[PDB]
Design an enzyme around this catalytic site. Structure first.
Site, mmCIF file in Angstrom:
data_model
loop_
_atom_site.group_PDB
_atom_site.id
_atom_site.type_symbol
_atom_site.label_atom_id
_atom_site.label_comp_id
_atom_site.label_asym_id
_atom_site.label_seq_id
_atom_site.Cartn_x
_atom_site.Cartn_y
_atom_site.Cartn_z
ATOM 1 C CG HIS A 161 27.105 105.639 -25.325
ATOM 2 N ND1 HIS A 161 27.341 104.367 -25.808
ATOM 3 C CD2 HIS A 161 26.565 105.454 -23.484
ATOM 4 C CE1 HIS A 161 27.835 103.785 -25.065
ATOM 5 N NE2 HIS A 161 27.274 104.332 -24.181
ATOM 6 C CG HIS A 216 26.571 98.647 -23.537
ATOM 7 N ND1 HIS A 216 26.894 97.802 -22.298
ATOM 8 C CD2 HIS A 216 27.109 98.660 -24.817
ATOM 9 C CE1 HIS A 216 27.993 98.602 -22.246
ATOM 10 N NE2 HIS A 216 28.316 98.341 -23.279
ATOM 11 C CG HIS A 263 30.567 98.854 -28.562
ATOM 12 N ND1 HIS A 263 30.414 100.288 -28.260
ATOM 13 C CD2 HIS A 263 30.452 98.439 -27.178
ATOM 14 C CE1 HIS A 263 30.724 100.168 -26.745
ATOM 15 N NE2 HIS A 263 30.608 99.497 -25.593
ATOM 16 C CD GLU A 311 33.622 99.356 -28.560
ATOM 17 O OE1 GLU A 311 33.995 98.826 -26.677
ATOM 18 O OE2 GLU A 311 33.852 101.070 -28.314
ATOM 19 C CG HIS A 339 30.696 95.157 -24.449
ATOM 20 N ND1 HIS A 339 31.133 96.497 -24.960
ATOM 21 C CD2 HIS A 339 31.570 94.412 -25.455
ATOM 22 C CE1 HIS A 339 32.255 96.273 -25.606
ATOM 23 N NE2 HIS A 339 32.583 95.350 -25.813
HETATM 24 ZN ZN LIG Z 1 30.599 98.360 -24.590
#
Ligand SMILES: [Zn+2]
Ligand SMILES: [Zn+2]
Length: 259
Positions: A63, A93, A95, A105, A118
């Site tokens: 992901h 990690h 996004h 996010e 994050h």
């Molecule tokens: Zn995250």
């Protein structure tokens, strides 16, 4: 391996089927409405102590990609701000989006950034990350927005290995990395109680979202976008738009560390 993803069929809209907490009372991410998030003068300064950080591996987890740290001792830790005690850095990690106008996010007055970093930390009052995730103050995630502009020199070591971990399950050594190179100059932040933004969506996180984004180059973000959700030889699903959208704030207040 994992069953869920970000497609129309396995994505955030459907996660509640397996993880009913997806419709819970303290879900993340959220929009940060700056008209209603209030300065809280009782918030302490945030203390980032990453000099002793020991990076281990980088992995395409299907992901996202993650970089892990030795969390067996207090090495890289987060203290202060809204937090009681010491929280050890376990991994970071990202996004990101398919286009620069989306990918984060958290949002700020509904604005989406190109990506979000994050840094995941767990509370040493528990034995390990597994115990911490079961408690309301188990984790602290430091969230940093990315915008496209000049290169982030402290990101280049990451970018340079992504071609080696294109598909799910590929990994590499990732040693001697200094995560201080991923921080912005200002540590002004918003904070609120929330959740993991991925399965299992546990309501275990104190979110600390920095106000100042870091700048990365287009070359750097393009390398993110050339990763794959799929495994080797499987139908190509480019790893883009691996972000959960904002969730209902319900009874919560978001606090600002600054006026
Ligand atoms: Zn995250
Ligand atoms: Zn698995």
């Amino acid at each position: 391996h994992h069953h869920w993803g970000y497609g129309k069929h396995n994505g955030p809209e459907h996660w509640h089927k397996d993880f009913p907490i997806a419709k819970g009372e303290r879900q993340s991410p959220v929009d940060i409405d700056t008209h209603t998030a209030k300065y809280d003068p009782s918030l302490k300064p945030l203390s980032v102590s990453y000099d002793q950080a020991t990076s281990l591996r980088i992995l395409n987890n299907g992901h996202s990609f993650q970089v892990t740290f030795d969390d067996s001792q207090d090495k890289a830790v987060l203290k202060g701000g809204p937090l009681d005690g010491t929280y050890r850095l376990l991994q970071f990690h990202f996004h990101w989006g398919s286009l620069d106008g989306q990918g984060s996010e958290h949002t700020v007055d509904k604005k989406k950034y190109a990506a979000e970093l994050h840094l995941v930390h767990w509370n040493t009052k528990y034995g390990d990350v597994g115990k911490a995730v079961q408690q309301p103050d188990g984790l602290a995630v430091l969230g940093i927005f990315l915008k496209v502009g000049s290169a982030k020199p402290g990101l280049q070591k990451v970018v340079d290995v992504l071609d080696s971990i294109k598909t799910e399950g590929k990994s590499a050594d990732f040693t001697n990395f200094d995560p201080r190179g991923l921080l912005p100059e200002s540590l002004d932040y918003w904070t609120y109680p929330g959740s993991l933004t991925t399965p299992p969506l546990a309501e275990c996180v104190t979110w600390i979202v920095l106000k100042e984004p870091i700048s990365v180059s287009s070359e750097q973000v393009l390398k993110f976008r050339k990763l794959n959700f799929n495994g080797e030889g499987e139908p190509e699903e480019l790893m883009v738009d691996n972000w959960r959208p904002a969730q209902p704030l319900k009874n919560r207040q978001i606090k600002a560390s600054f006026k």
